[PDB]
């Protein structure tokens, strides 16, 4: 499962590379935390996945599809800005005690 299991109102901040949502902490409170996926997600070749970084630099129209369980964007080659559209699931982004951390 992803942070969304116990988190709501997931939006795209910092242009669309950071996940901002209300993470329900153990105390039962909704704390707004942000995790930068641009550090572990990349798509300079036009393909999305975990490993490379700075995907925002090679993608357009970055928005969450499954309300936060998946991030959809069009990975475009930086060589010109042409490519294909795609989407990557964010099942690696977890929320521990209300703190959003990459796992």
Swiss-Prot record:
The keyword Magnesium does not apply. Coiled coil: none annotated. InterPro entries: Cyanovirin-N, Cyanovirin-N_sf. Induction: Down-regulated by nitrogen starvation. The keyword Nucleotide-binding does not apply. Mannose-binding lectin. Belongs to the cyanovirin-N family. This is Cyanovirin-N homolog.
């Amino acid at each position: 499962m992803s942070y969304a299991d116990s988190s709501r109102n997931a939006v795209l901040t910092n242009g669309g590379r950071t996940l901002r949502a209300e993470c329900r902490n153990a105390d039962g409170n909704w704390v707004t935390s942000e995790l930068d996926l641009d550090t572990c997600i990349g798509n300079p070749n036009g393909f999305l996945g975990w490993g490379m970084q700075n995907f925002s630099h090679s993608s357009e129209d970055i928005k969450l599809e499954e309300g936060g369980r998946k991030l959809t964007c069009r990975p475009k080659t930086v060589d010109g800005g042409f490519r294909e559209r795609q989407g990557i699931d964010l099942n690696r982004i977890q929320n521990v005690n209300g703190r959003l951390v990459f796992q």
